[PDB]
Amino acid sequence: DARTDIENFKIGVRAYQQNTMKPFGTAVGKLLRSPGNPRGVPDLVIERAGQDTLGVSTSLVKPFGGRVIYAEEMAGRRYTFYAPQVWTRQRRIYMPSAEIFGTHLCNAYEVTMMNEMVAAGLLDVTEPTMVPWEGLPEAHQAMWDNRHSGATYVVNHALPAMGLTTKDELLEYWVAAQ
Amino acid sequence: KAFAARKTQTQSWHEPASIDLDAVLEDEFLQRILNQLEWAGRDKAGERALDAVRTGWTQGMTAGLECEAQRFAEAIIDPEGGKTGIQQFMDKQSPPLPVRRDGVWEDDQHEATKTALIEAGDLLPLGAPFYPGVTAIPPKQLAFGIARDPDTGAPRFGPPETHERELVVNTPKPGANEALIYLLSSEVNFNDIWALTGIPVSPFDAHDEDVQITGSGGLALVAALGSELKEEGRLQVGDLVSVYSGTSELLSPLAGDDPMYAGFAIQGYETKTGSHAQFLTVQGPQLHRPPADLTLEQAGAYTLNLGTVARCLFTTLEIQAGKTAFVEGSATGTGLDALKSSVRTGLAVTGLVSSEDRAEFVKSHGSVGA
Amino acid sequence: VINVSGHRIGTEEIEGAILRDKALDPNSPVGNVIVIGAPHSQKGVTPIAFVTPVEGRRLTQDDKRRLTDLVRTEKGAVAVPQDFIELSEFPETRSGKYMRRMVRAVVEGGEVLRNPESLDELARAVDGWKRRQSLSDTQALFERYRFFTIQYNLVAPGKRVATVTVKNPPVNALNERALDELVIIAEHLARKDDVAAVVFTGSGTASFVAGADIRQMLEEVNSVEEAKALPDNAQLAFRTIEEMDKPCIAAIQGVALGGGMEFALACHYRVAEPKARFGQPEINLRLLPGYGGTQRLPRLLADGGGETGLRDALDLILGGRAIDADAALAVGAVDALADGSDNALSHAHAMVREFVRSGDDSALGKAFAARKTQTQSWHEPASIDLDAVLEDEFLQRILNQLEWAGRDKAGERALDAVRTGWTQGMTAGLECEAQRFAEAIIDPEGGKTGIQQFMDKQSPPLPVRRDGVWEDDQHEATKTALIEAGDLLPLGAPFYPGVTAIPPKQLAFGIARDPDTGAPRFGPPETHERELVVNTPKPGANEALIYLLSSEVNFNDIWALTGIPVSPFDAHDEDVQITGSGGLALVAALGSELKEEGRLQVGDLVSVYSGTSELLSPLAGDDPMYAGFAIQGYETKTGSHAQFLTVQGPQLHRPPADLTLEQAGAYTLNLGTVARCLFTTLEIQAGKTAFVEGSATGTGLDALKSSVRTGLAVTGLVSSEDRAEFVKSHGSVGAINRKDPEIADCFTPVPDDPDEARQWEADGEKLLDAYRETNGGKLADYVVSHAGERAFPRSFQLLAEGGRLAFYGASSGYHFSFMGKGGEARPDEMLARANLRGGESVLLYYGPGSHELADEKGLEMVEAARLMKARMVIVTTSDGQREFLQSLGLEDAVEGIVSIEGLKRRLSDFHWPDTLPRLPDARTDIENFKIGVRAYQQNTMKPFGTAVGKLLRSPGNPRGVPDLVIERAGQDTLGVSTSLVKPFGGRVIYAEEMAGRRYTFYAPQVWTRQRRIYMPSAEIFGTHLCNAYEVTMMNEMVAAGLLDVTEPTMVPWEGLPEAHQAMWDNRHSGATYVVNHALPAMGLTTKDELLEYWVAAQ
Ligand SMILES: NC(=O)c1ccc[n+]([C@@H]2O[C@H](COP(=O)([O-])OP(=O)(O)OC[C@H]3O[C@@H](n4cnc5c(N)ncnc54)[C@H](OP(=O)(O)O)[C@@H]3O)[C@@H](O)[C@H]2O)c1
């Protein structure tokens, strides 16, 4: 685990890449080379229920929509993969009766859609637990220790009072506080 | 003029220099480095370096160059030199280099520097009112994050409550597509912690700065705009805006597909600076108009957690009303935003918690169970 | 009873109006209401509305805003609550009665026993409220006028700075009331010793001040007394600012035009944004500068530039054209520009800061003392010979143009004002200017005509600028002169990026305005498309400069060159238009941000995509085509038919390497449009059939080959047998000759008489027999249309059951028509097809053709949309139909209803057409075509969209635009519905038997905004060009062989006009044309082969 022993964790990640993914991707890449796919990366992997190579396949398939499929019976077997390879690159695994879709943050257009839904009521902004500037380290630690005092934290930088709702209220309270 | 001047410059380098090399080497920081080289096993290389510097400095560049080449060839084949240093760099096990002069953060000198800069007009106190277009943008600012140890150069990672420190850093200048914003608040997200701790990846590996400021989101005022943002005419100095933390290659043809797939990076977590600071530079499309009916505490609180949940539920999963949904961590952060959002979408949402209080909490948000 | 500022009003009257929400909305969060008169600093007493909500309900700010407009519409704006205070409960007595006095006592602070503990919750809310009011009445930061805001800020312990911001929202125009406020503001701030300096600016990013209110000078000035008030008020404000004893900076963040330019000139220092533009367009309305322009502009520019300064000032007044900010600074009309991340307002305040700290040593203190001296000298006669300067030959070309455009008497008035002050002093000029301005306004042959023409879009052109004179006699002589010096490279000259100096002048093909009249010289390409000498552009931060080796020859060029149906000059302010959408070029220079990107490099061989968009908008992540999109060369001022060009980074692409140089920059516009049409819009599938218009040339050919290569049974429309053979040789199942005498006469629009229309449909029977004989009994599953008005109806008739037509053009005309296809469907299913989502805004027509209040299908549609959680507005025919619906308890579904009958009652000139009104072809009759379109917009759309919008406005849809329209087959309002529904994906759906009826709409409303129409048995999707990501997918498929570039028919530089005309006449000598600029040979395949053949030539 990267917490208890990070120097040996980094070595294991590198050995995986250098002795498995790089040699294997190179060989596959030479055969998939084409004017349409210069780097020779698979768009889709057909995995097989009778082995546990899913980590390699998710790590080799193209980033951002790369797909891995199973068609055979997977009952009674364990499969494994490296989590960041699927979510941070948003890769998809289609199985006969189940699907695992990686997802990572959002793009700026989806934010505008989100705020459109917040305006329309379809979404609801959880009211944050406000924290002073000095309380930020404690809020981080409270999250890390799973001792949340509320649903979600926000640090106050320069809000003169809580409850304000317009820019003009902000500036007005500032000149009043002096 | 330049070639004729350089001609006379080089021929003067063949004669001993008129500057005292020994005196400058007494500099406190140049000494800090030497001790750092000792700590990192490069003290021998340092000696060879200063030998060639000193040789050429007193016997002419020629005599120096001759010396430099011999030490370099010796250093390579040296079992304790290049054979160790190069293998170390190539196995990603190299000790850190020292910091730069402009990157020394010492705990005992922070509060003095803060107050001195505030005595001058060089740093605004925290919470200070800022009227865009009127208030002078200070050159310095306060912020939270991690810095490299001045003595060893290693990132001072650790538990947030003891290692996330308030620091005096520079106020950034926006590029042509960037805005400078004065932060009223900042989102407190878990990616802040992964960085501050260095688990499982060091944020310093993605940039070449001696300090890391985290922070992905918040409420801000527009303080300045790059030339192209003014051409766009969407934003305006003085606008109250919430911050979206995603950054991408806005000039890539691939933007039509998804900016997430065009050199994407989360600010504060995968960039040198973030929103846990007084001032921040952001790309244009990071700034948004908050929904009007929200309070100022609400406006800068949700764009990371709720934006992620929105993509997860409506883009990736494409959830269908009436269906069942199982959410982890349904009582805090993203889990709660997902719990709430799926309930409102019309699903039969069940939540996972680690306390009976949290189970009642999610049942009061419309869950069929906990 | 409360006395709201002497207005006696009962609290019950206010309470009742608030309670009406419960009678209008069965889901109202309002439960109980009490209204109290709370003490107010000035109003004396002001009504506060305490409300307890329904169980579980909260009182949103959208609710308070609705309950506020409710008292307004019911009683009056005087009886409006200042705030709405929510409470958990009211003081209830033994039995339940509400103790109004208890609440009144607490609010009023008086001495209130018989009831529960609610009393504490009131005080808490009254306390909180009474404190927000104290802060409002004591705040000294903002002074809020109707069209201005003053923001004070402490700079030194006794010196405040004042920021006066103009705010009249569309363009910050100054109407009379704003001049009234601006006088008071200037006089007040002048007397405040508290205020050390003043900074004027405008809100928003578009305009500082773009002029006086033009409509007001026409509709509210019917006498000289009324007219004289506008100069008199405006000049007094500007004189007050000018003569003030404090530095007054104009921070110009947008355009400063007309009165806004006169506003800035009144100030002591001027700092502007590089995007700001400046001018005096009053002459365009047969007026003149009336707020000081005829005095401060020639005086200011003459002090800076001597005789020439005066000349330059006469250019701006008599010509009336605007200049960019670099020119304004050069001539001396502004003093500084805010480069980089600096902005006008901050810059100004930094000058005030340095002035408070250094006084007269500051740059602002010197400018202020200097201006003082400057102003007083304007009050004496000027030293420059005016009559002599007016002998300048270009000033004469302007005067001769004013007579041509009917503005000579306006010019005479302006020179009179100029000359009066130039000889007698600013004061005499300002008096004469003011009188002449007011005389011109009321003058029937002046303002009354000019303003009318301007608003109705019937003004003649203004002259060209002094620097925009292209005379054909001069071209070849100027070209050689520039070439012989180091300023212009000969056409086809080698260019080694990073080595060859960039010439300042260049050659290009395009259209210039006539130097005598200012009218664009539109005409047939071979006679009117001309080679001109223009400037080599300079790239912006996100832009690149490229040296064009070849150039795509596309139809949009021709539409631009001929000014049909739209002038390319309406979208910019230059004196020359250059077309050209795509080509092959080298990279010559990269802006700061394209060097940061790292993708492009100086020297790269690249193909050009013609799409431009707001790269920095958040909406990029959706589709760049929906983020301020515009095609270069056609919808922008410059194009690729030139030596040099500037483009956005995303326009430049790496061509497939296995292509030749001729192909590389030859296909992107066409095949890219075809790509989005086939693979994105239609989503064509293998095994289906398809019908492709113009299959033998251009986009049609690209579509044919691409559809064949995806595995479809493509037949092509064709006009000559020789082309039908050519099309068949590309793997098609067949072709059809639209000119064959057996079917030629049937390719026409659908007549108005419904009986003729159904006969028209029969007359296409021979056509469908032809198609079917070649497709094993089947009709077209897909259709690609672009010919337009005279082929779309038949192309639609060729569709199969459940087929999908797309189109991206309409060469024959934009008046589209089609006979509906048999088939009925459920509103349920149709809204599903259109992917109706909860929260989207829907428009539904009720009682479409009749006055009978029963429309069973109409109610079914309401029920369908209601079940999908849709914000609905209903449009009925009559008031009886509207009142019929109001008894069906649809309040939880429809946000409102409006009847066409009601709009006709309230709007004399509102027109509801039975069908798209036919207009004269722009080819034949341009001016009357332009007149008819704006009649539709002004008398049909703008009224009907406003009424609908006001009922659909919500936070999620601030501008109240329908996301989808449920049309009705019994009417032909499709032109309205396609014009109203949001652009970029908007949808209209039919769910009823459309057979035997005609339906009409305006072509560009569907394709250029890519709106979709769903019908039971057919679908019409608009498509348009493509985004730069789709281009990467195109070249990707090209390299992979899934797509094939058609070899371009290469023509020389001198042949581009003929090549364009060949396309226009359908006299093609090949498939598509490309113009060669600097390709030394044909068959080259690498950049290094290009440069090596250049050296071999020299
Ligand atoms: N890819 C992205 O873009 C993105 C975006 C946002 C967040 N994240 C990541 O998602 C994770 C959550 O972030 P957050 O904002 O929601 O943090 P949070 O507010 O602190 O909540 C984390 C939740 O995890 C639950 N939890 C902890 N250990 C668990 C376990 N062994 N099994 C089940 N639940 C456990 C806890 O709930 P209970 O104890 O009640 O069960 C806790 O509420 C983080 O790792 C974050 O880095 C990623």
Ligand SMILES: NC(=O)c1ccc[n+]([C@@H]2O[C@H](COP(=O)([O-])OP(=O)(O)OC[C@H]3O[C@@H](n4cnc5c(N)ncnc54)[C@H](OP(=O)(O)O)[C@@H]3O)[C@@H](O)[C@H]2O)c1
């Ligand atoms: N929306 C967009 O982005 C976009 C993009 C590209 C092009 N366009 C437009 O689509 C149209 C074609 O562009 P292009 O480059 O392909 O032009 P093109 O190369 O000149 O070909 C147009 C074809 O249309 C056919 N045609 C002319 N009149 C016809 C009629 N009354 N009925 C049926 N067919 C007729 C002709 O073939 P036959 O006469 O042999 O039958 C002709 O070959 C133009 O109007 C263009 O403005 C739009």
